[PDB]
Structures are given as C-alpha cells and as structure tokens.
Amino acid sequence: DFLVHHAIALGLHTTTLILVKGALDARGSKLMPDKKEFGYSFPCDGPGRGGTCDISAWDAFYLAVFWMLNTIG
Amino acid sequence: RPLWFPGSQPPEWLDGSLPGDFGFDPLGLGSDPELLKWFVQAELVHCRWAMLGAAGIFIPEALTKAGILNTPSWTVAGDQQYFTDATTLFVIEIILFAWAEGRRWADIINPGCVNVDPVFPNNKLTGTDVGYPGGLWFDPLGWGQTGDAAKLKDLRTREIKNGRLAMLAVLGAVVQANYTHTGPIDNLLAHLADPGHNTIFAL
Amino acid sequence: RSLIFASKQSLSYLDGTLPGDYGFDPLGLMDPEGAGGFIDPQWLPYAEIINGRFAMLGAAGAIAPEVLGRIGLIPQETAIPWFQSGVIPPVGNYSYWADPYTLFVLEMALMGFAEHRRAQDYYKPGSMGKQYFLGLEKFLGGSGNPAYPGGPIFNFLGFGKNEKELQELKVKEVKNGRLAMMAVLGYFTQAIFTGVGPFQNLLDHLADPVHNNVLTNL
Amino acid sequence: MQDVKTYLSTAPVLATLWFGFLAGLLIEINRFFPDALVLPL
Amino acid sequence: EVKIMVEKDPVKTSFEKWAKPGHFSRTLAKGPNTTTWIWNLHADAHDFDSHTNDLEEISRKVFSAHFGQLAVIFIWLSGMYFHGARFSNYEAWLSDPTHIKPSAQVVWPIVGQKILNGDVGGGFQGIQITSGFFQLWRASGITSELQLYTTAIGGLIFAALMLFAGWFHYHKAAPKLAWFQNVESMLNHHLAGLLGLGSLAWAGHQVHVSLPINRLLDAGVDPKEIPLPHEFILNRDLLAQLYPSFSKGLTPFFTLNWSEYSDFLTFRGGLNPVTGGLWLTDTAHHHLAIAVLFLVAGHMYRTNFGIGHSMKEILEAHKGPFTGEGHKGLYEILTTSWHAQLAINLAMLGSLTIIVAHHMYAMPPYPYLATDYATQLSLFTHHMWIGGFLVVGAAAHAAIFMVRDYDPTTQYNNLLDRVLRHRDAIISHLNWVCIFLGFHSFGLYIHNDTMSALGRPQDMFSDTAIQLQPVFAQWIQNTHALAPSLTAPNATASTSLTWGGGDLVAVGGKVALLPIPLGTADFLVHHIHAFTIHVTVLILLKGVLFARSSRLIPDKANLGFRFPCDGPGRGGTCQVSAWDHVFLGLFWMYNAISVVIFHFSWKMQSDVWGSISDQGVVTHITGGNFAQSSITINGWLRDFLWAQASQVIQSYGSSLSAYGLLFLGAHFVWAFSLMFLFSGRGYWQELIESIVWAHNKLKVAPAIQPRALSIVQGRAVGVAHYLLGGIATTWAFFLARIISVG
Amino acid sequence: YIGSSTNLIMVASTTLMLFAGRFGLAPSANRKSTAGLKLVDRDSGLQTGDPAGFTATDTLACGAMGHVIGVGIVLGLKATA
Ligand code: CLA
Ligand code: CLA
Ligand SMILES: CC1=C[C@H](O)CC(C)(C)[C@H]1/C=C/C(C)=C/C=C/C(C)=C/C=C/C=C(C)/C=C/C=C(C)/C=C/C1=C(C)C[C@H](O)CC1(C)C
Ligand SMILES: CC1=C(/C=C/C(C)=C/C=C/C(C)=C/C=C/C=C(C)/C=C/C=C(C)/C=C/C2=C(C)CCCC2(C)C)C(C)(C)CCC1
Ligand SMILES: CC1=C(C/C=C(\C)CCC[C@H](C)CCC[C@H](C)CCCC(C)C)C(=O)c2ccccc2C1=O
Ligand code: SF4
C-alpha cells in the first residue's frame, strides 16, 4: 500500500507536472515566446530551432491524458 | 649509442639523456615530457624493489637448497606465522611507507623540497637529481656523488640494467611458481641437469 | 631473350633486369601501379630469393637422410624421411637431444637473431652494420640490393667477382630456386598421398613407372 | 599521451572507468557484506 | 584490367584524431555547443558518405569497418568456444544429451543471482543456453573441451588478424576505388574462393571428422574412448571399418566411380532416428555438391583473362518492349553506390536468414536439435528477427541510395526510372492488396471471434465450421511426401519428415518431427503473414519510391534522409521522410515477425513438439488446440498468451526467474518507448528549459546546453525501445515457456 | 581402364573442346560471343606461341569444359547404360 501510494503520488505529480507546464508555458516559453498568438491547440512551429513538436499547451494536455490514464489505472 | 633495434630510428622523447636509454618505446607511452619524468621515477623504484625482491627470492632459496638457511619458499613465506599478524603487518608497513613514499611523492612533484630533515634542520641530503636522493641515509659511501658526469651516467646505467634483469626475474619467479609449483632455484637445478627437456614445454 | 607465358600487362614492368625474368606473370602480381606492403616490386623478387634459398636448403635437406641411408653412410635411426623426423609428430617423432617444442624456441631465438637482421636491411640497406654485434658487424653490411649482400661472410669464396659473371649466375640461382619450391611442394603432396619418403618415391617409380605413378598410387 | 590521455578523459571512457570502478566497488561490498538491509552503525 | 590498385599510408596511425570526437564531419569538428552534438556524433559516426565526397576513402572506411566487424564476430566466437571449454557441461551433455540440458554460462554468486545457476544436469550449475552451440559442436565432431579451447584461441588469433587487417587496409596499404569497382573479380572470388572452397573445406571436415565421430556417437560409444579426429586421417583402416568405400583410397574420385562412394555420400533424406538431426552423409554430399557448383559458378565473370562475362554486357543486353532501355546504368548504380549494393545484399541476407529459420525447424541439421525444443524455438525466433531487421535495413539503404546516390542523368528510361515514373500505381495497388489481405485475414479472425462470442460455432472459419483448407499447400506437401517413389527416385526417404512420409522419430522420448497438418487455422495465419509482410513492403517500398519527391513535397531529396519533416504546412508534413518509412516498417517488422514466431511456437507446441509413450501415442505440449483456438484472437490471448505465459510469471524463486525479470523489464522498455513515440521535441525542450532554470538558480548550468532529443532521434529512440522491449518480451516468454515444458 | 568407356569419353570430351577452342568453334580468351552467339575477335593481352590465338587460359578453360561436360556424360551413361 505504501509502494502503490507512491505510485499514486507519482501519477498525480507527473500529471500535475505536464498540466502545470502546459498552463504556465501556455503564453510562451524560451523555445517559442509567441505561443499565445498561435492559439491554444496549434500543432507545432516547424522543424526549425531544433524541432517544435508538441510545443502547444493542448499537447501537454494530450500527454497528460496518458498520465491520468496511467494514474487512475 | 647502443639501441634495442639497430635498424630502427630512435624515438624523439628518448634522447639518450636518461640512464639505461636504448630507445625501446614501440607503444610510445613516454611521449609526454611530464609523463616521461613520472615513468623514469616509476622505473627507478621498480628496479630497486625488484633487486631487493630478487635478493629475497633467489638468494635465500639458493641457501635453502644448499642447507645454509632453513627459510621457507618465497611463495609460502607470507603464509608463515610471526609475532605480528600479517593483516596488521601491512598497516604498520603502510604507515611506515606513508612517510617513506609520501615524502618521495613530494620530491617527484617539487624537486629540492624534502631534502631537509624536519626533526633536525642541520641534517640534509646531498642530492641534486630527482630519484637519486643521496645523503647519509641513502648514499653512505658517496659513490653516487661524483664530479664527472660520464662515470656518473654509466653508474646510473649500471643500476637500471641490473634492475630490469630482476624485473624479468621476479616476474619470472611468479610465473614459474604458477606453472611448475616449484622454487626457481629448484627450477634452475632441474634445468641445469637436462636443459633440452626441462623447460616450459616439459608441462 | 627467352619469353614464356607472358602478356602485355606482364611485360610493362618485366623488362629483363631481373635474374629470372622470363615474363611469367599471368595474374599481374609485380605491378608497380598498386605497390603496397608485400605485393610490390621491391619485396616480391626478394621474397622469391629467400623462398628459393630455403627451398634449396629444403629440397636437398628432405632427401639427404634418405639417400645417405641406402648407400650406408649414416645410421638407420637417422636415415628416415623428413615428415617422420619430429616435424609432424603425428606421422612420426624421433627423439633428439631436445623435444621439438624446446627446439622451436631455440629455432626462433637463432632465427630471430638472423632474420630480424635480414629484415631491417631490406627496409634500409647498410643500417645494420653500425651497432656492435660481437665484433663482426663490419662484415654484415650488405649491398644495395638486400637479396645479395655479398660481404666477407655471404661471399666468403668471392665467387662471382665480375658483374657479367654474377648476373648470369643469378639466373642459375633462381631457376634452381624455382625448381626447389616445386620440389618441396612435390615433397608435400607425395608425403600425404603415398605416405612414404621422396627417395622411396623415386625408387618405386624407377622400377615400374606404369604401376607407381600418381594415378596408380592414390 | 597529449592525445591518448585526452581520449581516455572523454565522457564515455570516464563513464566506463568510473562505473566499472563503481559497480566493481558495490559488488565487492555485496560479497563481504551481503544481504544488507539495515545499516548497523 | 582487373589487378591490385592500392596506395601506401593514406592516414597516419595517430591518437590525435581519437581525441577530437567529431573529426569525420565538418559540423562536428567545431566541438560541442548543445547536447544534440553527442547524438549527431553517434548518428554520423558510421555514415561515411556524409563525411567525405570521395568514394575511394569511403570504400576504404567500409573495408576496414568490415574487418572490425569480422574481428568482433571472431571475438564473439572465441567467447562462445571459451564458454564451451571452461564454463559448460559439453562433455557431460555429450555423454547423454536427452536428459542434460545444454548450458554454457556460469554466473557469479554475488547478490542472490546464484539461483540462476540451475540444475541443468551432469553435475553442473549454470544458465541453460538456447543458442545451439552444443548440437553444432556435436555435428562438428568436437569431443573434448581442449578442442573448444583451441578453437577459442584460434578465433582470438583470427580476431587479432582482422584487427591487423583493418589497420593495414586503412593506414598502411589501402586499396583504391577501381580495386573495389572490380565486382566481377569479387563475385568470382566470393563464389569460388569463399562459398565454394568454404563448402569444399567443410565437406572435407564432414568426410573426415564429423562423419566417423558422429557415427561412433550413434553407436553409444563414450566420447572419452572415441578416437581423436586425426586418427581417422592417420589410421585409414579405422576410417575404413566405419565406411568400406574408404578402402579404395581416392581412386574412385578420379576414375568417375562416384557410386562406389555410395557408402558415405548418400541422398537419404529425413532425420537420424538415433539423434533427430539430418544425416552427415547427406550433409557431406550436400556440401561437396554446393562446392562443385559454387566453384563452377565462380568461373563465370570476366576479370582479366579474356574468358568470362562483363556484367554490364549482361545487363545492357537485357532490354524489353515493356521497358525499352531497361537494365542500362544499373552497373553504374551498383559500382558507384555503396547503398544500392547494401540494399541488395541486405535483402538477400535477411531473406536468406528467413530461409535458414525455415530450413532448420523443418530439416534440423544438428544431432539432438529437434528434440531440444528450446534450441529450435530460439534459433527460429532469432533468425526471423535478424532476417526482418536486415530486410528493413535493405529498404533503408535503398532509400539512402535514392536520396544521396541516385543520379537522374545516368538513369533515363531504364528500369529504375520507369519504376519511379509509375510509383503511384505500385503504391496504390500494393495499398489495395494490403487492405484486401487485412480484411480477408484479420476480419476473418474478427468474424471467428464474433461468432464464437455470439454462440455460433457453426458460423465460423474452423475445421468444423466453414472450411478454408489450403489446397495448394496441402497439395505441395503431398507432392513433397509422394516424391521419392516417382519424381525423385535415388532418395532413400523424403526431404523432411513434416511432409507426410510417416517416420515418427522418437529421440529420448520426445518428438523430433512428424507430418505437420495444415488446416483452416494455418490458412488464416498464413494470410495474416502475407498481409503483414505486404504492409511492411508497403511502408518500406513507399519510402524507397517517394524518397526523391512526392506529390506533397517535390523537393524531398534536397531535405535528405534523416530529416523530420518539412513543417506543419500542406496540412502537415510530419514523417514525410524515407527514414520515417523505415521507422514505421520497423514496427511492421515487429508485427510481421512476431506473428510469424507466435504461429511457429503455437503450431509446433500443439502439432509437433511433445512426447511419445508406449504403443505409439503422441501427447503434445498443448494438445490439438491450434486447430480450434488459433482462429480467434481470444484463443491467441488465452491459449497462447495466457496459458503459455504461466511459466514466465511463476518462474520467480527458480533458475528461470531472470526470464521473469527481463519479461517485466521488457514491458518497461516497451512502455518507455511509448514515451518517446507519442511525445514530441518542443514539450521536452521547454521542460528542459525549466530544469535549466533550476540549474541556473544553483549555478550548475552546463556550458554544453541541455537540449531535447531531435524528432528523428526521438523517433529512433522510441522505435529502438519498442523493438528492444517487445523482442525481449517475446524472448523472455519463449525462453521461459519452452525451457519449462521442454 | 585405358579401353574403358570412362577413359574414351573423358579423352574425347577434352579433345573436342580443345579442338573447338583452337579452330574457332568455341568461345575463348581472344574471341568473344555476343548476344547473337557470334564470335567476334578481341585482344585479351595474353601472348603464347599459337598463331590462332590459343593461350594458357583456353587450355584450362576448354579442359574444364572438357571435364564439366565429360563428367556428366560419363555418369549420365552410367545411370542409363
Ligand atoms: C579467393 C579469394 C577470396 C576469398 C576467400 C574472399 C573472402 C572474403 N572476402 Mg574478399 N575479395 C577477394 C578475394 C577473396 N575474398 C577479391 C579478389 C576481391 C577484390 C575484387 C575481394 C574484395 C572484398 C571486399 C572489398 C570485401 C571482401 C570480403 C570478404 C569476406 C566475406 C565476408 C565474411 O564475413 O565472410 C566470412 C569470413 C570469413 C570466413 C573469414 C575468413 C578470413 C580469412 C583470414 C581468409 C581471408 C583472406 C583472403 C581473402 C583469402 C586467404 C585464404 C587463406 C585461408 C589461405 C571474406 C573474408 C568482405 C569483408 O568482410 O571485408 C573484410 C568485403 O566486403 N572481399
Ligand atoms: C549490414 C548491416 C547494415 C549496414 C552496413 C548499416 C549501415 C548504416 N546504417 Mg543501417 N540499417 C540496417 C543494417 C545496416 N546498417 C538495419 C538492420 C536497419 C534496421 C534497424 C537499418 C536502418 C537504417 C536507418 C534507419 C538508417 C541507417 C543508417 C546507417 C548508417 C550509419 C548509422 C550510424 O552511424 O550508426 C549509429 C549507431 C547507433 C546509433 C547504435 C544504436 C544501436 C541500436 C539502434 C540500439 C541498440 C540496440 C542494442 C542491440 C540494444 C542493447 C541495449 C543495451 C545497451 C541496454 C550506415 C550507412 C542511418 C543513415 O543515415 O544512413 C546513411 C539511418 O538513418 N540504418
Ligand atoms: C617500457 C615499454 C615500452 C613501451 O611502453 C611498450 C611496453 C611493452 C609496454 C614497455 C615494456 C613493458 C614491460 C616489459 C613491463 C614489465 C614490467 C615488469 C615485469 C615489472 C616488474 C617489477 C617487479 C617488482 C617491482 C618486484 C618486486 C618484488 C618484491 C617486492 C618481492 C617480494 C618478496 C620477497 C623479497 C620474497 C618474499 O619471500 C616474498 C615477497 C614478499 C613476494
Ligand atoms: C603443345 C602442343 C600440343 C599439345 C597440346 C595439348 C595436348 C594440350 C593438352 C591440354 C589438356 C589435355 C588440358 C587439360 C586440362 C584439364 C583441366 C583444365 C581440368 C580441370 C578440371 C576441373 C575443372 C575439375 C574437375 C572436376 C570436375 C569437372 C567435376 C567434379 C570433380 C572435379 C572437381 C575433379 C600439340 C600436340 C597440339 C601440338 C604441338 C604443341
Ligand atoms: C523524454 C524525451 C526526451 C528527453 C530525453 C533526454 C533529455 C535524453 C536523456 C538522456 C540522459 C538520461 C541524459 C544524459 C546523461 C548523461 C550521460 C549524464 C549521466 C548522468 C546519469 C545517466 C549517470 C526528448 O527529447 C524527446 C524528443 C522527442 C520525442 C520524445 C522525447 C522524449 O520522450
Ligand atoms: S514532424 Fe514536428 S515539426 Fe514537422 S509537422 Fe510534425 S510536429 Fe510539426
């Protein structure tokens, strides 16, 4: 029960990690400062500047749906 | 200049200034000048420990075969019982060699700094070269401090070449004990009887 | 000017300055266009010399204890074929003063003091007669061509003083050299097929040649 | 050794030499002191 | 014109180029500036075409890399013979192999892992090996571990020779470009010198060493009293007592009385009833025939002796009215591009390894190979995975040839230009046959699952429901069983036991082989196999054909091979690259090869592998459930993935518990793959920006800037963990189940 | 064995193929067959004493086709007659 409660705390903490990261890097970040002017659910920003796949806040929600599924699983 | 491989060109880092220099560096590990001075210092204490090693392996076992002394074999000499346990014989030696080799560690790094006795400052070592400390404790006869440099280089060359024969000998005594399970004086007398057959291929 | 088994690729580099320059190179091995480490025109004539002289010491040496045993000049214990003489201890082992594994270490110690000196004269001629070697390093200097040193030791009768005489005699060395390599290769295949020494193979063929050839005997 | 020791000081070699020493140490701790669940000191 | 072109000392053997890591690439020679430099350091390490534009130095790099690979394989073989010599029970297994399991790995007793040294038999503790080395050494005639140690030190000698040759052919005498472009000589010396003389030398070993020792091993003679292999060569009467045809002594070979060699050169067929492995009189006649046939085929091409073929003259005379100027320039393709030859060689080596897998479960070449079921499952599974990886790499280097070595000026109106000219037709008709195969195999499985779920067993595709009997396979198996009587006279028995010629071979109370039935279940799973192979061909051939350009991106060849995308334009151009098609074909190779080895494991655990009791009754491992449960996905999940996984999960506390640990850790690596596959770079880059902020706060910022992995690199890491985790899952489940029930 | 059928075939298979390679009936080193099976002359570079162009390669090549064909005729007639 101790070990799976730390699994639960891992799940809530990592889902909160992706979701707080999506909510607070929603307007912009150091990779792309104008994320607010591209809307919420934009796909990417192109292969330039290293690569900007899943840069949007909707994509952090997308990656944290897997983490809520793993958490509640 | 005598060289180990008379057709080969001698290496640039081995200029013949070192004692016992015969240009033998096929792997070239002494190419760095800072690492060459460490390796010459490594070869000096290797030579003198092996000559002290060869006088405790081949000298008393020859006296054991001749019946002069009843000392055990060199392989089973550490297994014998003494007044001090062999586990705590090491930490006495480690403490005594933290002053012997640790003060030797400073001479390789900083030359001419540990040549003064700390208890009595009037006592000092009459040595100017790294690896050859001199003084009364190490050169009580004064043969290593000569005015001429050609005789001094040959005497240091005589020290190195006597050393590297023993580094072949103590390594030779290790593998002979692993292969024949017999003392190297007894391996010599077995080889002195029939040298055609009593060899490494006698199995 | 005898020329056999030649091609226009082969005569581009075999111009006749060699002793055994008969033009025989169908594969194109002494080509100077792709000269490398061991396939090059500087090592390959010198490789045929050392393989020739070891085969002339080999073809004569593998038949001499068998010929001398039939005429009665050596004891019959040493009058044995070459393969059952400690070389291959499966087909036969003869007891010398040492076992052949110790004798091999004595071999490569003396070959290592003889062929390392022969090696470094090829890479640079005359560079070995400078370091001290038993007071005899002056005679071991060699010529520019490393196959023929011709010093006071390797030419100690001085036979072949004239340049025209020595060059024509070099042709007789390689032609006797090449015949000895085919003899030792001939000695090797007869030792496996017939299983008996080469002088017995000559004596068996000289009695009944139509019943003791290669086709009848395996 | 101006460049051989530079290669020996690279990131994969020094990770192999440290973790070879690190796993070499922790295995030899786990031989003379095995099954260690509670630190007694 | 074929002759040796080398040149002396191209690069000096120095360690100053070892110290600079990115010396081969101009971009990496400036040193690191981000953490992506480390990944492009390894990504461009072997990519020799991206280093230099000179094909001569590229070919020298490839030749010395081949020698380094040969050194690595000889070090590996040295290890496996040293493990047989010192850390095995090969003499104990060789005394009696029907009760002692093959084991050649001893672990150290350190942390509780000494339970992995299990009771394999013969008074020995160790990891039970499944690599088949013990049966291979029994087929080689190896009797003692001194011979294994001699082969290990000889392999170490050859590994030092390959290292010396790799140094020699890059730093002392490296060949020039026209030496590597002599492909006629290379084929002449690979067909005759390598595969012909290699088969001839192994035929000589299997005449003198393998055959009499393995004949004495069939007689129950103890291997410590069996005469040594050179005693048959020396004492030929000892060789003649086992085969009287040796008493004639090489005179029937040169007088064409080869039928007098019928004592030891036979066309028997089938398996040895003593051991369960092929006959070595047949394996020696096989090697003598493929040697007298590869040496004939090695005298085909024109080097410099007048006779032969210029293969450009073979190609340029092969032109047809449906193609026009076909086959022209393909010699210039295959002699100026290493990737095109790599594509062909990788396709042949992968397909050949798949041939090896089928021709070893079916015709087991080694004594007691078939009855040791762990060896058979592991050898088939290993060669299927290697073959699938090599055919995906074949399509990879085909695509790299298109993006980096395909010159359109030299290829006009040939076969390759016209294949590019109708690539929409190829990919669309392949797409149609893939969708048709997907419905007509997997929807048939879904139909069987649905009517078995709905309580309609008569509405299914069973052997009792609507039958789908493979009449072509069931006829070709009868044609291969009823062959010796009329179409292949001179055969004592038939080629394989799995054809239908009877001969229930029982070795050690365990079934070696018998007639393999083919029913509705085999039809369904073979159509699954054809479907999955076709879809893997579809992604891979789409990446080869659309490597140059597409309707979407007409300048795709300028973007390269390992580029992620063009961008979010044209609706989104994600995974347009040919690399991404190799990346997806790796998953489809997982799907294809995993269903192949699953069909293999269930098909022979249900219909082949088992035991024979008295009065000729055969009890299989999972008795007869392939014909009824392998037609539904619930049977595959239930009677294969659940019933046979009841030995990988309760192996804990035993010697097979490392298979349980790697089963679970393989699930871990697979779910770790789903982190890299499903995510993208920019999220991880901004998360790393937050971590870099936390490092800036505590002044522990590295000067090498932490970066997220690249999109090509993130897909590469995801597919590497997906293949590693899933393949290790199947490896652990297979090697726990078939060791436990074997 | 001299008058046996194995010797008479293998002599005649080797002799007729060497006759074909010398008298311009078979492909050799100095004459090439095209796709139309027409003998066209070439310079392979190999020099022997034959005025026709027969070299040391062809006496090994036609000896081999004297032997590859000749083995098959002997063992073909051994299984049949
Ligand atoms: C009859 C001569 C002959 C034979 C036997 C081979 C054999 C081989 N070649 Mg080679 N080759 C030759 C001549 C020959 N070559 C010619 C004439 C050309 C020039 C046009 C090439 C150019 C060529 C290249 C460019 C490469 C090879 C490679 C290969 C290797 C195949 C890969 C492998 O794993 O095989 C199985 C491997 C083995 C069984 C190992 C055997 C190694 C031993 C020491 C023999 C090799 C030395 C030599 C070729 C033959 C000496 C015979 C000796 C036993 C008496 C193998 C060593 C490939 C390779 O791996 O490069 C290193 C490679 O791509 N070949
Ligand atoms: C005969 C074999 C062969 C040949 C010669 C090559 C040669 C090459 N490949 Mg490859 N290829 C092949 C077969 C082969 N491959 C197969 C088997 C596949 C399918 C996977 C492909 C797919 C393919 C693609 C997708 C691409 C290449 C490319 C490359 C090039 C350089 C790659 C590099 O620098 O290494 C880099 C090496 C590594 C990163 C090592 C990682 C090894 C794997 C991926 C992970 C570890 C696996 C290991 C078994 C698990 C251990 C885990 C443990 C440590 C915990 C080079 C031309 C690349 C290129 O640009 O070509 C020009 C590239 O884009 N290959
Ligand atoms: C230089 C070079 C050059 C390049 O670099 C390359 C190379 C090759 C690398 C090189 C070389 C090298 C080498 C040869 C090495 C080796 C060494 C040695 C052997 C040492 C020993 C060394 C040795 C040593 C010190 C020794 C020591 C010893 C001792 C202490 C002993 C002791 C003892 C005694 C008394 C007796 C008793 O009862 C016991 C005991 C206790 C036991
Ligand atoms: C000088 C002269 C002459 C002569 C010539 C001649 C006579 C020739 C000969 C030649 C010959 C006569 C040749 C032959 C050759 C042979 C060969 C080249 C062989 C090869 C072989 C092989 C190829 C192999 C074999 C086989 C087979 C086939 C099968 C299986 C088995 C075996 C492997 C064994 C005359 C008189 C005209 C005139 C004057 C001058
Ligand atoms: C996790 C993840 C990352 C981040 C991955 C990173 C940063 C790799 C981490 C590698 C190691 C763990 C860091 C480097 C380790 C150093 C060698 C230092 C050693 C420290 C310990 C390992 C000893 C991506 O960049 C990415 C990109 C595209 C799609 C998916 C993903 C993705 O899922
Ligand atoms: S690969 Fe990345 S950059 Fe390209 S379209 Fe997809 S998400 Fe956008």
PDB file of N, CA, C and O in Angstrom, chain E residues 155-176:
ATOM      1  N   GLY E 155      40.327 -18.529 -32.789  1.00  0.00           N
ATOM      2  CA  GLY E 155      39.471 -17.406 -33.115  1.00  0.00           C
ATOM      3  C   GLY E 155      39.993 -16.087 -32.590  1.00  0.00           C
ATOM      4  O   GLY E 155      39.777 -15.049 -33.211  1.00  0.00           O
ATOM      5  N   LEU E 156      40.643 -16.101 -31.421  1.00  0.00           N
ATOM      6  CA  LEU E 156      41.308 -14.898 -30.922  1.00  0.00           C
ATOM      7  C   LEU E 156      42.472 -14.493 -31.819  1.00  0.00           C
ATOM      8  O   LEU E 156      42.711 -13.296 -32.035  1.00  0.00           O
ATOM      9  N   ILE E 157      43.200 -15.485 -32.347  1.00  0.00           N
ATOM     10  CA  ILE E 157      44.267 -15.228 -33.314  1.00  0.00           C
ATOM     11  C   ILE E 157      43.696 -14.609 -34.589  1.00  0.00           C
ATOM     12  O   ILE E 157      44.214 -13.606 -35.095  1.00  0.00           O
ATOM     13  N   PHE E 158      42.587 -15.165 -35.093  1.00  0.00           N
ATOM     14  CA  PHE E 158      41.927 -14.580 -36.261  1.00  0.00           C
ATOM     15  C   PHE E 158      41.306 -13.217 -35.974  1.00  0.00           C
ATOM     16  O   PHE E 158      41.244 -12.384 -36.876  1.00  0.00           O
ATOM     17  N   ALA E 159      40.864 -12.958 -34.740  1.00  0.00           N
ATOM     18  CA  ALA E 159      40.356 -11.634 -34.391  1.00  0.00           C
ATOM     19  C   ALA E 159      41.473 -10.599 -34.381  1.00  0.00           C
ATOM     20  O   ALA E 159      41.280  -9.460 -34.829  1.00  0.00           O
ATOM     21  N   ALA E 160      42.653 -10.991 -33.887  1.00  0.00           N
ATOM     22  CA  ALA E 160      43.831 -10.138 -33.996  1.00  0.00           C
ATOM     23  C   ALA E 160      44.240  -9.936 -35.449  1.00  0.00           C
ATOM     24  O   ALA E 160      44.703  -8.850 -35.815  1.00  0.00           O
ATOM     25  N   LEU E 161      44.052 -10.957 -36.294  1.00  0.00           N
ATOM     26  CA  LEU E 161      44.344 -10.816 -37.719  1.00  0.00           C
ATOM     27  C   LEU E 161      43.368  -9.867 -38.408  1.00  0.00           C
ATOM     28  O   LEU E 161      43.772  -9.098 -39.286  1.00  0.00           O
ATOM     29  N   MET E 162      42.085  -9.901 -38.030  1.00  0.00           N
ATOM     30  CA  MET E 162      41.124  -8.961 -38.608  1.00  0.00           C
ATOM     31  C   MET E 162      41.371  -7.536 -38.126  1.00  0.00           C
ATOM     32  O   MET E 162      41.185  -6.585 -38.892  1.00  0.00           O
ATOM     33  N   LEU E 163      41.778  -7.366 -36.862  1.00  0.00           N
ATOM     34  CA  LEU E 163      42.157  -6.037 -36.378  1.00  0.00           C
ATOM     35  C   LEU E 163      43.403  -5.514 -37.088  1.00  0.00           C
ATOM     36  O   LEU E 163      43.464  -4.332 -37.458  1.00  0.00           O
ATOM     37  N   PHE E 164      44.392  -6.390 -37.304  1.00  0.00           N
ATOM     38  CA  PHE E 164      45.598  -6.015 -38.033  1.00  0.00           C
ATOM     39  C   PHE E 164      45.289  -5.681 -39.486  1.00  0.00           C
ATOM     40  O   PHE E 164      45.863  -4.745 -40.042  1.00  0.00           O
ATOM     41  N   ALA E 165      44.366  -6.418 -40.107  1.00  0.00           N
ATOM     42  CA  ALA E 165      43.999  -6.131 -41.487  1.00  0.00           C
ATOM     43  C   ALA E 165      43.159  -4.866 -41.604  1.00  0.00           C
ATOM     44  O   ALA E 165      43.264  -4.155 -42.607  1.00  0.00           O
ATOM     45  N   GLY E 166      42.330  -4.570 -40.601  1.00  0.00           N
ATOM     46  CA  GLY E 166      41.606  -3.309 -40.592  1.00  0.00           C
ATOM     47  C   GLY E 166      42.513  -2.111 -40.409  1.00  0.00           C
ATOM     48  O   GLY E 166      42.264  -1.041 -40.972  1.00  0.00           O
ATOM     49  N   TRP E 167      43.567  -2.266 -39.608  1.00  0.00           N
ATOM     50  CA  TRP E 167      44.574  -1.213 -39.530  1.00  0.00           C
ATOM     51  C   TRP E 167      45.395  -1.134 -40.815  1.00  0.00           C
ATOM     52  O   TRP E 167      45.750  -0.038 -41.264  1.00  0.00           O
ATOM     53  N   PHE E 168      45.677  -2.287 -41.429  1.00  0.00           N
ATOM     54  CA  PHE E 168      46.548  -2.353 -42.596  1.00  0.00           C
ATOM     55  C   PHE E 168      45.883  -1.765 -43.833  1.00  0.00           C
ATOM     56  O   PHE E 168      46.536  -1.082 -44.629  1.00  0.00           O
ATOM     57  N   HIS E 169      44.587  -2.014 -44.008  1.00  0.00           N
ATOM     58  CA  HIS E 169      43.859  -1.554 -45.179  1.00  0.00           C
ATOM     59  C   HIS E 169      43.214  -0.198 -44.971  1.00  0.00           C
ATOM     60  O   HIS E 169      42.294   0.164 -45.711  1.00  0.00           O
ATOM     61  N   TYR E 170      43.665   0.546 -43.971  1.00  0.00           N
ATOM     62  CA  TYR E 170      43.352   1.956 -43.856  1.00  0.00           C
ATOM     63  C   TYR E 170      44.567   2.826 -43.591  1.00  0.00           C
ATOM     64  O   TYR E 170      44.534   4.009 -43.945  1.00  0.00           O
ATOM     65  N   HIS E 171      45.646   2.285 -43.022  1.00  0.00           N
ATOM     66  CA  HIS E 171      46.788   3.092 -42.627  1.00  0.00           C
ATOM     67  C   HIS E 171      48.109   2.671 -43.247  1.00  0.00           C
ATOM     68  O   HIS E 171      49.067   3.449 -43.181  1.00  0.00           O
ATOM     69  N   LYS E 172      48.205   1.476 -43.822  1.00  0.00           N
ATOM     70  CA  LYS E 172      49.461   1.020 -44.400  1.00  0.00           C
ATOM     71  C   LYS E 172      49.374   0.783 -45.897  1.00  0.00           C
ATOM     72  O   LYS E 172      50.219   1.282 -46.646  1.00  0.00           O
ATOM     73  N   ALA E 173      48.387   0.019 -46.355  1.00  0.00           N
ATOM     74  CA  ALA E 173      48.194  -0.229 -47.785  1.00  0.00           C
ATOM     75  C   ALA E 173      46.690  -0.248 -48.029  1.00  0.00           C
ATOM     76  O   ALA E 173      46.048  -1.295 -47.908  1.00  0.00           O
ATOM     77  N   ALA E 174      46.138   0.915 -48.378  1.00  0.00           N
ATOM     78  CA  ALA E 174      44.699   0.845 -48.576  1.00  0.00           C
ATOM     79  C   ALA E 174      44.374   0.818 -50.061  1.00  0.00           C
ATOM     80  O   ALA E 174      45.046   1.487 -50.851  1.00  0.00           O
ATOM     81  N   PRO E 175      43.368   0.042 -50.464  1.00  0.00           N
ATOM     82  CA  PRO E 175      43.047  -0.067 -51.890  1.00  0.00           C
ATOM     83  C   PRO E 175      42.414   1.201 -52.442  1.00  0.00           C
ATOM     84  O   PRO E 175      41.843   2.017 -51.719  1.00  0.00           O
ATOM     85  N   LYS E 176      42.535   1.358 -53.754  1.00  0.00           N
ATOM     86  CA  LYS E 176      41.952   2.497 -54.439  1.00  0.00           C
ATOM     87  C   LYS E 176      40.551   2.136 -54.930  1.00  0.00           C
ATOM     88  O   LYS E 176      40.063   1.025 -54.715  1.00  0.00           O
TER      89      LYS E 176
END
